[PDB]
């Protein structure tokens, strides 16, 4: 249905969106400070492998 | 020459594209600001609504 | 002649090539400036967001 | 989230800034001295061979 | 694009500067000595025939 408390449901969705935004912002800050898109295997596996091989 | 080409390829694959990444940072900042503003706006007036009339 | 050759090799192994090292110096300078800018951006936003919420 | 006790992004920025500053200092020292090799920590074998050649 | 950790154009410039400097040093040697072939690298058969003629 479409009935939601808007206190402990709207809050939950807002918190999830805010957490996603903050995580994206932190990853972007890391990528800007480091100068490398790929800082760990999580971000890109094959790309990290090939970049390591090239280095 | 091979070293120069290898460095070019490695930069293509790994090095940060600042033009894209600064825009991504600003977009994330704006999104977080909007999220916090909406969280403050809600949960205070509408939540208090179910109580002010009771 | 042997001294000339030995000095050439010694300079090549030891003496720095100013082009490469100046490029490295400029890159490091820019990286430091970017780091300071990012640190300034990242010190204020997170601490300030929670205080704004309150 | 917006927890204020500890922000990992700050530590990451500080670590990369420290790396950049260390490389900047090394580049400055190399430019000023004129010798790419100025301590054993840099490259042992190169230092040994260069000292022998000198 | 607008990268930081890699400067391909600077690498090409360094390579071409190195080529120019090497050619300059070779030309300077050939001017100073007065002989075109001072080492076998400049010419093998040329050096052999020149030595025989001398």
Q: Where does residue D13 rank: exposed (0-12), middle (13-18), buried (19+ CB within 10 A)?
A: buried
Residue of E1, E4, E5, E8 best to disrupt the B interface, most CBs of B under 10 A: E8
Query: How many CB contacts within 8 angstroms connect chain A with chain E?
Result: 4
Closest CA to D42 of C29, C16, B7: C16
Of C45, C52, C53, the CB nearest to B29: C45
Long-range contacts of E37-44 (CB under 8 A, 24+ apart): none
Chains touching chain C at 3 or more Cβ pairs under 8 angstroms?
A: A, B, D, E
Distance CA A39, CA A36 (A): 6
Chains touching chain D at 3 or more Cβ pairs under 8 angstroms?
A: A, C
What's the residue count for chain C? 54
- Enumerate the residues of chain E whose CB falls inside 8 A of the CB of residue A36: 5
Closest CA to C14 of E24, E13, D39: D39
Q: Where does residue A14 rank: exposed (0-12), middle (13-18), buried (19+ CB within 10 A)?
A: middle
Find the helix packing angle between B18-41 and A10-34, rounded to 10°. 150
Query: DSSP characters for A9-28?
Result: SHHHHHHHHHHHHHHHHHHH
**Mapped to the 3 state alphabet, what secondary structure does E30-47 carry?**
HHHHCCCCCCCCCCHHHH
Could C38 and A35 be called an inter-chain contact, meaning their C-beta atoms sit closer than 8 Å? Answer: no
Q: Which of residues 1-55 of A touch E (CB under 8 A)?
A: 35-36
Closest CA to A17 of C46, B32, B21: B32
- For this PDB entry, the determination method is cryo-EM
Of C18, C28, C49, the CB nearest to D20: C28
Nearest chain C Cα distance for residue E4, angstroms: 7
For chain D, what is the radius of gyration of the CA atoms? 18
């Amino acid at each position: 249905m479409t009935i939601n408390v808007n206190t402990n449901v709207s809050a939950m969705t807002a918190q999830r969106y805010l957490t996603k935004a903050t995580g994206e912002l932190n990853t972007s800050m890391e990528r800007l400070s480091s100068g490398n898109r790929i800082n760990s295997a999580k971000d890109d596996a094959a790309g990290l492998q090939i970049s390591n091989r090239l280095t | 020459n091979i070293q120069e080409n290898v460095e070019a390829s490695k930069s293509r694959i790994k090095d940060t594209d600042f033009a894209k990444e600064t825009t991504q940072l600003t977009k994330s900042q704006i999104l977080q600001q909007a999220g916090t503003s909406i969280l403050a706006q809600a949960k205070q007036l509408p939540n208090s609504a179910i109580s002010l009339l009771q």
